[PDB]
Design a protein around this ligand. Sequence first.
Ligand code: NAI
Ligand code: FMN
Ligand code: SF4
Ligand code: SF4
Ligand code: SF4
Ligand code: FES
Ligand code: FES
Ligand code: K
Lengths: 430, 230, 213, 44
Amino acid sequence: KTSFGSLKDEDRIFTNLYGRHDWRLKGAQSRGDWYKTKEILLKGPDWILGEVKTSGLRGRGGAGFPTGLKWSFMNKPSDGRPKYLVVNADEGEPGTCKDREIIRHDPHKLVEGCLVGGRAMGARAAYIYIRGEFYNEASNLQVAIREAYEAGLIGKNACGSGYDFDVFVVRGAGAYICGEETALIESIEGKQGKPRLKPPFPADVGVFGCPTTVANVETVAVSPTICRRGGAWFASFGRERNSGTKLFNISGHVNNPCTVEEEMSVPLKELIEKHAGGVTGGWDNLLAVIPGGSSTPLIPKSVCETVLMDFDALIQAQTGLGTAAVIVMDRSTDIVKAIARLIEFYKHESCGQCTPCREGVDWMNKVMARFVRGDARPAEIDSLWEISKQIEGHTICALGDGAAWPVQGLIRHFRPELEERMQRFAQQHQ
Amino acid sequence: SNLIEVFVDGQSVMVEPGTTVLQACEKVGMQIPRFCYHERLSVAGNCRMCLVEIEKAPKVVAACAMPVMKGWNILTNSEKTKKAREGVMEFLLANHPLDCPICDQGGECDLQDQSMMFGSDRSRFLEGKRAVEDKNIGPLVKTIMTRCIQCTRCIRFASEIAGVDDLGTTGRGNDMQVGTYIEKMFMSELSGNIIDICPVGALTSKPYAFTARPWETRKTESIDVMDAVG
Amino acid sequence: ALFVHRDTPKNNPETPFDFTPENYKRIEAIVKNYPEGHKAAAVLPVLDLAQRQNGWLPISAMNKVAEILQVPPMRVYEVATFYTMYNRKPVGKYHIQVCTTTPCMLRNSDSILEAIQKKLGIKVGETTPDKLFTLIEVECLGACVNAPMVQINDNYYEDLTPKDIEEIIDELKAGKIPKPGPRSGRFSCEPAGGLTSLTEPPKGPGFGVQAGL
Amino acid sequence: PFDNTTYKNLQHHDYSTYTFLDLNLDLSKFRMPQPSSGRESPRH
Ligand SMILES: NC(=O)C1=CN([C@@H]2O[C@H](COP(=O)(O)OP(=O)(O)OC[C@H]3O[C@@H](n4cnc5c(N)ncnc54)[C@H](O)[C@@H]3O)[C@@H](O)[C@H]2O)C=CC1
Ligand SMILES: Cc1cc2nc3c(=O)[nH]c(=O)nc-3n(C[C@H](O)[C@H](O)[C@H](O)COP(=O)(O)O)c2cc1C
Ligand code: SF4
Ligand code: SF4
Ligand code: SF4
Ligand code: FES
Ligand code: FES
Ligand SMILES: [K+]
């Protein structure tokens, strides 16, 4: 297959994405959830890991790490410490709202994914770290967990397999930096949400010092469907090493901003013109697209024509798939103001533990405010580029890279706009 | 023996398993620049000055917290190591106040010495610097939090050696401040040792304030007689 | 906005605060949710529960949480100052938070901000003299496809115009509670031009199950 | 009767401030016993 897209409704992972059906246990069990889970738990953790890694499923958090190897990292005999599975339900990245829909309208899929993953790596329990803002979603998730507990699906002797598995929900307290796995682990332990240094990896020392595997909501909820339908069916979609389906949140300057499930290698133009109803003012009015949320750089209208929405094609285009969050800006947008607002967001959401991000992101915030106002000189522009090269790769966590990348993308694709703004300010003020 | 062979600038050296890169470089005789590392405190790894380049590895690693692997070639004088050191010095000196003539750490400041050795020689910071409100922790330690570099040796010493657990970092981002968050004094029997471990002039000795300068003092090695410890 | 504390007469360690017995049972359940020897992992919910009893956190719930969990109070101070939800200053009855990040700014959230500022007669970070509304600015709240959007207390009000947020404020001032949903035609996140996907009924159990399972 | 026109997630209109904590309190009776680290606290 060379052309991708137009996914049929029978192949969608997340049926009832929009909440049109019952989200409770009766409604979820009638859609195929919680079906033959005992066979999955009894066929073996190695069988589950093999079925996961055969499908070519990658991490849906944004890193794109292969989840089969990551889940098999902690598939080791115990040394007296318990093992833990942790679900990352923070979703603080701008443009990304898919996990909210997953935990609001399909919570039993998340619970079954927690059980299947915990059996896959021998985890004692599941700690779902939900966002603090998502109070109603957390209440719905706890209601579904209570329904699963009452029906005997989770808890002592889960689904009649002899495996004991608990599911816990921990509410956050409004921190974007707590979305990253090590900072999330420290946040569960009742400390400041400051990321750890790897090594040690969470598979060796994680939450409470126990071995821990942190996985996204989307990459957990697909695993029961992986075990039931099979890995080859999931591998049939998408290109090589880009297999499966993806939840895309299209927002910004579009006709119909929406969350939709589609294939992995869909062209961006086809996806926007089909599911979002096209951008405002037609495709000739498009200025820029951020394809993977605020952590990824933008691409201009020329790049957007023949780009595929998977990991490899966007890495080739000097960007990343990220969380598959398409923010669209038309030609009536002050894009420098948008990038300055993104850098201000990164300055306000920064844990401040390590020096390069803590000073540099504030430095880019000040110089991008000056760039928006035009009170700068062109020789600063390359200097700002160098500042980005002093943040990317020299930080504890990846918030520094995710703050340096939008500045680099904005500079690379719109240096003439910034130079025109600076020369206009110099003409009008001197 | 279970020693493993690592390389510092092409020179082989045997180390115990679990040894860090910084300890191996100290074994071969090279002192990697550091701010938050202390051999009697727990490893924090946040100042990012100890970043060094391993050969055939496209990412600098923090030598104060990175255990050595077999066959690793550590390059302590490579080009990108010096680039990382210069960038970290620029970030550290971006918000530091111009207080060197009126600061008691002048002449024995670690930040000054490593800025002279491994840092650059000019500033590109055209913006305004931050200012931090001063704190009071007693009549022993004079506190100027504007000069702090958030190295978190304060909390590590007060939690692991003094056993007080009264200092901490309040806030987030560039507004993160080291303090007690309330009007409390840090009175332990080993409090003044924090003046020894602060690499900057944020915590100074209040009786010693504005009296002398390190280059003009003569050092005489003697023995304390205040107790029977010696 | 200050990250240091000064003992005001209305905010001091002698300010009376204590948990209700049902809140105490909730606290016991929360600390039973965690393994033994790691009781400090319950610092994050329990302290928040204290705010859920008071609406704000003076420095007497901080010390009480530190006392009932056997942790030093400095760790509780660090936790309360690090996270943005913990109100160390007494906010009004309805804490309006307007998202002004780039995906919400692209859909004209500043118009909502100035509409609320004109209706309530206050500014960003200010409180009404009746102690009813507090208007501040927040980052992305995870409903970017429903931009522009505000959050009032625990509820989300999305897909708003200035008229819709004025009606929300009018309903809140009258003593009622509105429906926490998008103000447009769509229900949660579907496209406004009808369902572009998931039009077919779901297949049900046993669909596509591989052999040997 | 199949119906794709109504929104079935209407329970969150009736959730109170203590709904999550009461749900956790009710769930506390179903949980398995927690493991122990052998000490009361790391400061013990
Ligand atoms: N989903 C979201 O809300 C956001 C996502 N992102 C994206 O996430 C990524 C940055 O996040 P990270 O967690 O730092 O990604 P990545 O550097 O860490 O690694 C992903 C996972 O693989 C594991 N891993 C990788 N190499 C390993 C090894 N050799 N041994 C053991 N485990 C190993 C890590 O422990 C982690 O769990 C970027 O791609 C960024 O675009 C960024 C911001 C927000
Ligand atoms: C600053 C930052 C914020 C992040 N926020 C989230 C998040 O909110 N949700 C999430 O699933 N991953 C987030 N991540 C990515 C995680 O580090 C990690 O990749 C994820 O929890 C698990 O990835 P996986 O899908 O491969 O299992 C964030 C990463 C960084 C650097
Ligand atoms: S890069 Fe920023 S957010 Fe990440 S650890 Fe360093 S200071 Fe914290
Ligand atoms: S601490 Fe060092 S760099 Fe800072 S003012 Fe004092 S001597 Fe100068
Ligand atoms: S005051 Fe000194 S010792 Fe304390 S954290 Fe700051 S730089 Fe480190
Ligand atoms: S000495 Fe290693 S990061 Fe500070
Ligand atoms: S950008 Fe406003 S909710 Fe995400
Ligand atoms: K000092």
